[PDB]
Amino acid sequence: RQSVPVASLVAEFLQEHGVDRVFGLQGGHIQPIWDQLARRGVRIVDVRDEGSAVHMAHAHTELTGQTAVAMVTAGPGVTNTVTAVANASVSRIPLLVIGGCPPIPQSNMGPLQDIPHTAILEPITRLARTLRSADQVLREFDEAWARASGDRGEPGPVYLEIPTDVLRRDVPPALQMREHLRAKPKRRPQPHPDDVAAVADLIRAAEKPAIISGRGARTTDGTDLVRLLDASGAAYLDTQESRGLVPDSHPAAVGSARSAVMRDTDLLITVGRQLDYQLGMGSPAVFPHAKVVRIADTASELIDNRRGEVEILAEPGAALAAIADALKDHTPDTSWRDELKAKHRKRAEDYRQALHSTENGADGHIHPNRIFGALDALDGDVLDLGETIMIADGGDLLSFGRLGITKARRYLDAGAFGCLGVATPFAIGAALAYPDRPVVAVTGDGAFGITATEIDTAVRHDAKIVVIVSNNRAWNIARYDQAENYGLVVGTDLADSDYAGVARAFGAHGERVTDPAELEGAIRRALANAPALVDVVTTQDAASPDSGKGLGFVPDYQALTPWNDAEVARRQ
Amino acid sequence: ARQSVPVASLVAEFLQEHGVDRVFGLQGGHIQPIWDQLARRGVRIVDVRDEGSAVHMAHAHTELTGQTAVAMVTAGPGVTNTVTAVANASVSRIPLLVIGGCPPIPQSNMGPLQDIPHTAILEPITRLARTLRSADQVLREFDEAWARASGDRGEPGPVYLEIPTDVLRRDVPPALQMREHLRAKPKRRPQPHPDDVAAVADLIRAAEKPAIISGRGARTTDGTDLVRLLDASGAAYLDTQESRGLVPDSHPAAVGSARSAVMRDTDLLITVGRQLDYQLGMGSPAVFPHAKVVRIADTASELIDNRRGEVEILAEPGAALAAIADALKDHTPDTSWRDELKAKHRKRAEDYRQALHSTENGADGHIHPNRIFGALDALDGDVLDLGETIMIADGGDLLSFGRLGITKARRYLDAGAFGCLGVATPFAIGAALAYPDRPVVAVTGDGAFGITATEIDTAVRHDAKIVVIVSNNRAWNIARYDQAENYGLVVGTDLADSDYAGVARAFGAHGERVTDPAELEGAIRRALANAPALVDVVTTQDAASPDSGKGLGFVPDYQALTPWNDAEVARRQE
Amino acid sequence: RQSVPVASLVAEFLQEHGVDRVFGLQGGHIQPIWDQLARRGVRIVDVRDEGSAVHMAHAHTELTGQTAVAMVTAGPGVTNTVTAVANASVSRIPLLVIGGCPPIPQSNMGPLQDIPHTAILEPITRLARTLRSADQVLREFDEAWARASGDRGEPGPVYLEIPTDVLRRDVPPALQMREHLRAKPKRRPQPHPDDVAAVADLIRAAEKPAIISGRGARTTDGTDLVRLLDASGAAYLDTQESRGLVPDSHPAAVGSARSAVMRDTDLLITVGRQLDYQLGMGSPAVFPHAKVVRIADTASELIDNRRGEVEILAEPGAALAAIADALKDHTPDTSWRDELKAKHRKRAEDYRQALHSTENGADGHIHPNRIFGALDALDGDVLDLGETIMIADGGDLLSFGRLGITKARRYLDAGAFGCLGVATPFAIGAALAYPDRPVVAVTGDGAFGITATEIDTAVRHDAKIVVIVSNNRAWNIARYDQAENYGLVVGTDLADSDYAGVARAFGAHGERVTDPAELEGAIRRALANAPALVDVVTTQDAASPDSGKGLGFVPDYQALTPWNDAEVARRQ
Ligand SMILES: CC(C)(O)C(=O)SCCNC(=O)CCNC(=O)[C@H](O)C(C)(C)COP(=O)(O)OP(=O)(O)OC[C@H]1O[C@@H](n2cnc3c(N)ncnc32)[C@H](O)[C@@H]1OP(=O)(O)O
Ligand SMILES: CC(C)(O)C(=O)SCCNC(=O)CCNC(=O)[C@H](O)C(C)(C)COP(=O)(O)OP(=O)(O)OC[C@H]1O[C@@H](n2cnc3c(N)ncnc32)[C@H](O)[C@@H]1OP(=O)(O)O
Ligand SMILES: CC(C)(O)C(=O)SCCNC(=O)CCNC(=O)[C@H](O)C(C)(C)COP(=O)(O)OP(=O)(O)OC[C@H]1O[C@@H](n2cnc3c(N)ncnc32)[C@H](O)[C@@H]1OP(=O)(O)O
Ligand SMILES: CC(C)(O)C(=O)SCCNC(=O)CCNC(=O)[C@H](O)C(C)(C)COP(=O)(O)OP(=O)(O)OC[C@H]1O[C@@H](n2cnc3c(N)ncnc32)[C@H](O)[C@@H]1OP(=O)(O)O
Ligand SMILES: Cc1ncc(Cc2csc(CCOP(=O)(O)OP(=O)(O)O)c2C)c(N)n1
Ligand SMILES: Cc1ncc(Cc2csc(CCOP(=O)(O)OP(=O)(O)O)c2C)c(N)n1
Ligand SMILES: Cc1ncc(Cc2csc(CCOP(=O)(O)OP(=O)(O)O)c2C)c(N)n1
Ligand SMILES: [Mg+2]
Ligand SMILES: [Mg+2]
Ligand SMILES: [Mg+2]
Ligand SMILES: [Mg+2]
Ligand SMILES: [Mg+2]
């Protein structure tokens, strides 16, 4: 070891921790680190808006399991990340944001961009610190990295900033400890056999067990989950954050039976999943028959809203496998599961077939379902959807996408936070992580306007993305809530903008589609010329399931009207 | 068959159902609705003279019993009087619940009586700090906060809940009162991964001088799996103030008078439920120059701080210790380093303990405080069983003398890593009410005692059989010493020759003064037979504790003590 | 100038800012400052509990107008001040708390007493900072001092901490600027003549104008206030924080007519006073006839709860004088004022006379009013109450004191915060500020137990205080609310403690009184042998006005039942 500046040690820490790319937007306050990363051969993915850098890191970590890194300058560089940080905090995604900040001598004197970054981010981070001791910077980075995994909290974003004078200070070689530089393995807490046995007992007693998966299940490869489904005879639901773990053809996979599974299950088993608004707060109003069991590697997925008759705090894979083993010699009763599955096959197959022929709305424009029809028709022709990363974003478009996207290797979307604008940044992070296939993002026009200039970033860094815009000249789920519940549409219309032209202005391939029969051809050309955008002129006369269920209205007790009605009855 | 009842009734029931049989507090209007309901269910109310003392009593209760304890305080100054005791619990990572009063929702921000931002003041030193504005969700919020106090979504420590008085009085329909939120919950038991267990056993097989240092998380076990691992590993053993009492004094590993020698030479430091904070030299290579590091804990607050393990086990510590012991089944440890320390320890500790009975008066003619520990040792097996006694220490010099003078105790409590002066009397009261059969003896500096002296009243009114012994040296003496030695000017560190026995008698406790060291055993004997009691010992200012000699008072740049700091300064210049 | 350590410059800053005493409790982290203060001859008033030091500083500033200073060590030294800081923040009293904290190199490493002091205090301070730049420490002190006066906020407490390594760092002489060292005058914003004229117009139109005073009025000597009372014919009420500004014999002074003034005034003029719970939130329910005008040097006494038809933001003295001048040639209609005054003379005189002969309660013990009777009887004999600083504290005792203490040079009490325990610390700060007269504090036994050991501090520093304890073996306003509203008394009884014995154990003169006829003699002996305590064995059978009006109950909308009833009617 030799005496080297803090900036050098930070670049080395990152590379040794397995960071081969940093997302960011340059400023003077972070230039010392930016320079050292480039000199070590860490790829710098520079963006048009720092928020997008943090979104890219989110997508990288969620897909790969490797903690990802954004770097931004002081002041507006940091404040531009708050949305993307909050989004990662809600989704419990490990990531590190490195911020610039003013030299220590000028503290509180009104130097350029002295604002309280750590106080702004503290509520939505696992850690937010200013590092004022050159010798301790390495230690602070390693500890923050561990806290991003969930140590002393739960998985999510961490923020570190180093005053520019400290970045330039040398650290003597004695104080540069290998144990802080090196990569660390993930923790693997194991289940207690008595909890495993108690869950197996509940499964044996249940007639309609159901497993709902989430983030923590999606950190596994799905095989231990499938073992437990086979051993238990449980029905299976996933969530936006846990798609892709169980084959569609599995006798448990009943994705078109969400309401029926929740209404009738007598044993809800959550696997790395919150009982947040997406699952009716786990309310007895939404699960009127269910006993509850919770399995997770974080109490953020054990204690919220409902408590388990058993709760297992362990690596979910190990817990699923242990419970499967414990059900050695059990003959599951699968008759409810099988009855749902027979209905599911009809419902899901009729729905997927109908995507190819959805009528234009009353305004003469494409129904957005035809986008998902066209993608389905191209499967096995010009792309393999089973190898493809799919992304959805928007309001009505997002709700249609949840039903229209049925084969994907991986799925990302606006998340429980409802974070519009993720589509393009996510696509870029996904595409640079998995350079072999195009990544396909389908987005509302409203959501796309937030991050459209990142098309430039995809072109400059050669991220092979296809963006498909549902261009309905509107914030349409908003416009619909305005008409139905208020009788006045105001400030929710957009214009017939040329998003293909925006894409072409930033060097991407672009095409506009007004005729639904042109979709397959346009998506074929976009895939062969990624990065590319397909601007689809879509109808305003198409209510998504989210629209129909009052998501826009914000009821008192539940996100959706039917759940809220059930909660009002429970409360009497 | 549940009925519609007020939030205040549901809170009292939640607490009782979670195993709460006592609440420490001080009444105010904002919390009276809960206070009343606790009394009507038969939960004992231990009312104090200062809310901070209530939170100290809860801390002592949880630390000793493992049962999360509860303090209840009114809005405004009731809540703000808890901040020190909350911070203390936060540093020590002790689960506890503080329930605060606060103004009715309609008056928010309007200058109602005692509207201050309690949650913002406490957020930095709690695992959770919330105002509960939805009557039907109060039970849920209590149960989740209780789990966060155990360490869920954070690490063990204090949580804060406050319920606006209008919410306390609102009815909750019976369908919304869920059994799953009312019922007591078992502690979590994450288990070790066998590959980590194997990797630690491999490091132990390869070490020549393994050493285990225990802390809080070890002290949550009964010590028997720790002993199994000591036996299988041949490791030397050190404890810390927060982990006394787990290993028999005569165990071949127990080498408490060889602290420097263990740290200087160990080639494998194993932390068990212990932080590498200032009390262990930040785990610095300057203080552990030969050590590989392994960390075992049920919380990463005792795995990632300052040093990283070659292996880190995140599990219930008992299970991890037992697993590693099993893995060493056929290992024959090399115990020659441990045994050589142990032989020197036996003599050093025995000579130290013997000399306590005869320590000379200082140049000012007053008792050396070590004679307090001599007297207690002399009474062991006569009028008290030290092995069954909860010992407490507090102060500056007195506390440092206590760390060597208190060697036999069932359990030990003190000022903590936070250096929280004034814990002695509140801790003794919580300890005595938890263990009413048992001797409870607290030894304190005069300076520390003045912070919570009026709690003697609480001990008398609630019949807490405590003995407080005051090292009355008319000074904040570790401070006075640092002033003289490093600054050449003693100012604002002298106190007076106060009659602390008279203070105790004024509050209906037994009290006696001792000026002659030969009177100490008799005065402590009379105090034990007449508890609650105070013994006011007139002690010397001419007596430097180890803490005093090592520069604790000076606050060096890198380490709490001069010798460690010198070692760190050398490390920084390689 | 020469190169000197930060610790030296801090001691010099304080002395040059007019600080001749610092209240505190020693620790290693602040020893460098403590030492330098002593070497410059600043008196160190060392206490038994840091909270008491901050209370002492509060009392000094409230009485003298000089910003006062407490100094405490890291960790529990700082956390022991939070109550006294909150109290000063509620009362808007300028003061500076200097805290110790760990050296910068050990930040976040678990050094001794590293807790987030600034985050704990930020919500109840005008400023809370860690000072990490030796050269900028002086500047930070001067700016914080200004913010304690109300610059960039409103008057109140500020907190500064200096890491011990920074305290020991030298500052070159160039960077030690005279402008930061020197004392600064208070600000004196002036009224706008059009606002002055608009208030005079409202007074001319009013038939029952009333002035209520507060903190900002009490920063004046009362003479401009009396000029405006004379010019306006207004009735006058003060509050606990504004006693002593208007002679008792003034035709406006109607202190026994509080309810009548609020019910019937058609023009409420607040002068440096909040419309907080102490004035019924200024609700139309409590002031049903009143137009509102607000005068203050801080918007903290202009915008809360009621807005003025006119609001004057100015030095209150100047504003009162300007409005008096503007009422040149007005003949006030004083008939309502005079009618209140005639009733007030009877009510207040009967009340004061009855204090001398109040019967023992049913339990055979002294009614606490006899304490105020005895003090009244000694006036002009062994003390001059008109030159005496009176302090009250407790529950029932505090409410009796508000009526029983009618002549004092100055009055302090538990404040709008209801801060039990202030009595002894306040008495000590008052006595060291005004060494010529004994200071008299009357306290409940409950409140006294919080700070009783400060009797030691009064003895060691020779603060000539007399403490009189209403020893009713109870938190009695609490016990009464328990009996009346709940039918169960539990955890509100105390014991028949020997507080005289506690005082004597700390070297003070002490005496116990069981016979009300012994009060004058005991108080005479206490005054001649201060510091002294008189332990009065008092009745539990005595409801204070606060007790009778439901203060203990905490109604939904107002602090007191009758105000709350009026608010409930207003809300229908
Ligand atoms: C750090 C990084 C890169 O990551 C960032 O985030 S930078 C953020 C984006 N940039 C900014 O926000 C700008 C920040 N800096 C400034 O605001 C300015 O540099 C300053 C206020 C600190 C200094 O500005 P000046 O006081 O130098 O003002 P200017 O108006 O820029 O004048 C420059 C020169 O032109 C002169 N000048 C002005 N008007 C002129 C005129 N009309 N004709 C000729 N000369 C003219 C002026 O006198 C002066 O010359 P001199 O007297 O120093 O030689
Ligand atoms: C409030 C506002 C407007 O300002 C916002 O900010 S909104 C923010 C942007 N939007 C979001 O972030 C979305 C938030 N909402 C949601 O995530 C969802 O509404 C929910 C998670 C709360 C509830 O979703 P569901 O549990 O209904 O799940 P979906 O996958 O949407 O399925 C809807 C229906 O289609 C069904 N379905 C699923 N896949 C199918 C398939 N392949 N074929 C046929 N039907 C299928 C499914 O069973 C169900 O029907 P049913 O069982 O209720 O009858
Ligand atoms: C800064 C200020 C003044 O403002 C404050 O606020 S201070 C706050 C109040 N004080 C505290 O909270 C104490 C803080 N400090 C400590 O906790 C300790 O100094 C330390 C943890 C940092 C260091 O303690 P040690 O590791 O030195 O442990 P001790 O138990 O005190 O042992 C001291 C010595 O006695 C030895 N010893 C222990 N038990 C013995 C026995 N039974 N017989 C003989 N010797 C014995 C022990 O080995 C050692 O000698 P050596 O090996 O260094 O020579
Ligand atoms: C909630 C709990 C118990 O947990 C707490 O924490 S309480 C905290 C400790 N207590 C406090 O901090 C006190 C808080 N409350 C108050 O400050 C007062 O209740 C108040 C400011 C809200 C209202 O006080 P008032 O405006 O009633 O003022 P007082 O000076 O108390 O006067 C009471 C009555 O005596 C009258 N009075 C005043 N001086 C008199 C005199 N000299 N002779 C005769 N009568 C006199 C006065 O006019 C009035 O009678 P009326 O006009 O209403 O009929
Ligand atoms: C940053 C932000 N601001 C507003 C909103 C609120 C919202 C959620 S969905 C929606 C309409 C989306 O319009 P889009 O054109 O993308 O989709 P479509 O319905 O198919 O026309 C809005 C305004 C959110 N969640 N995020
Ligand atoms: C609340 C608080 N304020 C100050 C301090 C700083 C301190 C730590 S030790 C000490 C002196 C203790 O004097 P004592 O009389 O108890 O013991 P002895 O040395 O034997 O005479 C001080 C002032 C701490 N830690 N906490
Ligand atoms: C730190 C704090 N904790 C509790 C309370 C709540 C309270 C306000 S008044 C009172 C009773 C006071 O008893 P005392 O004996 O002093 O007076 P008396 O009624 O005449 O017997 C309590 C408990 C407050 N405000 N502050
Ligand atoms: Mg933005
Ligand atoms: Mg749209
Ligand atoms: Mg002492
Ligand atoms: Mg206190
Ligand atoms: Mg009382």
mmCIF file of C-alpha atoms in Angstrom, chain C residues 297-414:
data_model
loop_
_atom_site.group_PDB
_atom_site.id
_atom_site.type_symbol
_atom_site.label_atom_id
_atom_site.label_comp_id
_atom_site.label_asym_id
_atom_site.label_seq_id
_atom_site.Cartn_x
_atom_site.Cartn_y
_atom_site.Cartn_z
ATOM 1 C CA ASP C 297 -41.034 42.789 17.502
ATOM 2 C CA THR C 298 -41.532 39.167 16.261
ATOM 3 C CA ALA C 299 -44.256 37.604 14.073
ATOM 4 C CA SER C 300 -44.291 34.753 16.694
ATOM 5 C CA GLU C 301 -46.593 37.300 18.537
ATOM 6 C CA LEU C 302 -48.475 38.565 15.367
ATOM 7 C CA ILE C 303 -49.702 35.577 13.220
ATOM 8 C CA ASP C 304 -50.548 32.795 15.722
ATOM 9 C CA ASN C 305 -54.273 31.824 15.787
ATOM 10 C CA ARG C 306 -55.714 35.334 15.190
ATOM 11 C CA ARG C 307 -54.606 37.930 12.618
ATOM 12 C CA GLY C 308 -54.743 41.682 13.438
ATOM 13 C CA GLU C 309 -56.942 44.070 11.506
ATOM 14 C CA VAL C 310 -53.577 45.885 11.952
ATOM 15 C CA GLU C 311 -50.292 44.183 12.870
ATOM 16 C CA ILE C 312 -47.269 46.285 13.879
ATOM 17 C CA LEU C 313 -43.864 44.565 13.646
ATOM 18 C CA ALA C 314 -41.644 46.926 15.661
ATOM 19 C CA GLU C 315 -39.918 47.472 18.986
ATOM 20 C CA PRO C 316 -43.022 47.500 21.228
ATOM 21 C CA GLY C 317 -42.046 50.607 23.251
ATOM 22 C CA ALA C 318 -41.746 52.712 20.076
ATOM 23 C CA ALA C 319 -45.073 51.352 18.756
ATOM 24 C CA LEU C 320 -46.936 52.052 22.056
ATOM 25 C CA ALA C 321 -45.478 55.608 22.190
ATOM 26 C CA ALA C 322 -46.379 56.271 18.506
ATOM 27 C CA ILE C 323 -50.013 55.151 19.032
ATOM 28 C CA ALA C 324 -50.230 57.252 22.253
ATOM 29 C CA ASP C 325 -48.996 60.287 20.248
ATOM 30 C CA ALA C 326 -51.551 59.549 17.477
ATOM 31 C CA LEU C 327 -54.364 59.700 20.107
ATOM 32 C CA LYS C 328 -53.440 63.369 20.760
ATOM 33 C CA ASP C 329 -56.843 65.088 21.068
ATOM 34 C CA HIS C 330 -58.865 61.872 21.720
ATOM 35 C CA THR C 331 -61.053 61.873 24.859
ATOM 36 C CA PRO C 332 -61.262 58.167 25.792
ATOM 37 C CA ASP C 333 -64.545 56.746 27.078
ATOM 38 C CA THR C 334 -63.389 55.046 30.335
ATOM 39 C CA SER C 335 -66.786 54.068 31.736
ATOM 40 C CA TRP C 336 -66.374 50.243 31.133
ATOM 41 C CA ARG C 337 -62.767 50.287 32.403
ATOM 42 C CA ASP C 338 -63.870 52.268 35.528
ATOM 43 C CA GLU C 339 -66.815 49.941 36.215
ATOM 44 C CA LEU C 340 -64.425 46.900 36.065
ATOM 45 C CA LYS C 341 -61.888 48.764 38.248
ATOM 46 C CA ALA C 342 -64.527 49.475 41.005
ATOM 47 C CA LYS C 343 -65.436 45.726 41.066
ATOM 48 C CA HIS C 344 -61.709 44.754 40.899
ATOM 49 C CA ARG C 345 -60.873 46.871 43.989
ATOM 50 C CA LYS C 346 -63.446 44.964 46.097
ATOM 51 C CA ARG C 347 -62.657 41.502 44.672
ATOM 52 C CA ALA C 348 -58.825 41.815 44.830
ATOM 53 C CA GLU C 349 -58.836 43.486 48.281
ATOM 54 C CA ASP C 350 -61.245 40.930 49.816
ATOM 55 C CA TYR C 351 -59.086 38.141 48.295
ATOM 56 C CA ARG C 352 -55.765 39.536 49.607
ATOM 57 C CA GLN C 353 -57.186 40.200 53.134
ATOM 58 C CA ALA C 354 -58.650 36.604 53.295
ATOM 59 C CA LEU C 355 -55.134 35.108 52.666
ATOM 60 C CA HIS C 356 -54.265 35.988 56.354
ATOM 61 C CA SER C 357 -57.054 33.836 57.791
ATOM 62 C CA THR C 358 -57.704 30.957 55.337
ATOM 63 C CA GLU C 359 -58.954 27.923 57.372
ATOM 64 C CA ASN C 360 -56.976 24.659 57.467
ATOM 65 C CA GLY C 361 -58.487 21.981 55.168
ATOM 66 C CA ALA C 362 -60.507 18.991 56.458
ATOM 67 C CA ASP C 363 -57.223 17.045 56.996
ATOM 68 C CA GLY C 364 -56.134 19.640 59.593
ATOM 69 C CA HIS C 365 -53.257 21.084 57.463
ATOM 70 C CA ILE C 366 -52.388 24.636 56.335
ATOM 71 C CA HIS C 367 -54.159 26.068 53.271
ATOM 72 C CA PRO C 368 -51.328 27.175 50.921
ATOM 73 C CA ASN C 369 -52.924 30.651 50.627
ATOM 74 C CA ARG C 370 -51.618 31.303 54.187
ATOM 75 C CA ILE C 371 -48.084 31.267 52.629
ATOM 76 C CA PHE C 372 -49.088 34.308 50.506
ATOM 77 C CA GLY C 373 -50.867 35.867 53.534
ATOM 78 C CA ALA C 374 -47.653 35.620 55.569
ATOM 79 C CA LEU C 375 -45.486 37.115 52.754
ATOM 80 C CA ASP C 376 -48.056 39.993 52.423
ATOM 81 C CA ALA C 377 -47.940 40.586 56.227
ATOM 82 C CA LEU C 378 -44.080 40.799 56.155
ATOM 83 C CA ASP C 379 -44.095 43.408 53.365
ATOM 84 C CA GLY C 380 -42.625 46.705 54.724
ATOM 85 C CA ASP C 381 -41.441 44.846 57.868
ATOM 86 C CA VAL C 382 -38.533 42.484 56.942
ATOM 87 C CA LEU C 383 -38.814 42.649 53.138
ATOM 88 C CA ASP C 384 -39.946 44.945 50.392
ATOM 89 C CA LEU C 385 -42.084 42.779 48.040
ATOM 90 C CA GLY C 386 -41.942 45.653 45.454
ATOM 91 C CA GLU C 387 -38.132 45.028 45.242
ATOM 92 C CA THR C 388 -38.427 41.197 45.485
ATOM 93 C CA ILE C 389 -38.168 38.579 42.670
ATOM 94 C CA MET C 390 -40.998 36.081 43.249
ATOM 95 C CA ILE C 391 -41.037 32.591 41.675
ATOM 96 C CA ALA C 392 -43.868 30.050 41.669
ATOM 97 C CA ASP C 393 -43.910 26.365 40.617
ATOM 98 C CA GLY C 394 -46.154 23.307 41.038
ATOM 99 C CA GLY C 395 -49.794 22.460 40.225
ATOM 100 C CA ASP C 396 -52.370 23.722 42.752
ATOM 101 C CA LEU C 397 -49.564 25.740 44.445
ATOM 102 C CA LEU C 398 -48.766 27.496 41.089
ATOM 103 C CA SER C 399 -52.485 28.358 40.482
ATOM 104 C CA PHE C 400 -52.804 29.709 44.105
ATOM 105 C CA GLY C 401 -49.570 31.665 43.558
ATOM 106 C CA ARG C 402 -50.944 33.437 40.462
ATOM 107 C CA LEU C 403 -53.593 35.088 42.748
ATOM 108 C CA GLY C 404 -51.461 35.205 45.965
ATOM 109 C CA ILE C 405 -48.420 36.993 44.467
ATOM 110 C CA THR C 406 -49.624 40.576 43.765
ATOM 111 C CA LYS C 407 -46.532 42.718 44.632
ATOM 112 C CA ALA C 408 -43.198 41.633 43.174
ATOM 113 C CA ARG C 409 -40.492 43.542 41.294
ATOM 114 C CA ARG C 410 -40.478 40.556 38.891
ATOM 115 C CA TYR C 411 -42.337 37.204 38.638
ATOM 116 C CA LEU C 412 -41.088 33.889 37.074
ATOM 117 C CA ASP C 413 -42.925 30.534 37.016
ATOM 118 C CA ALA C 414 -43.287 27.170 35.205
#
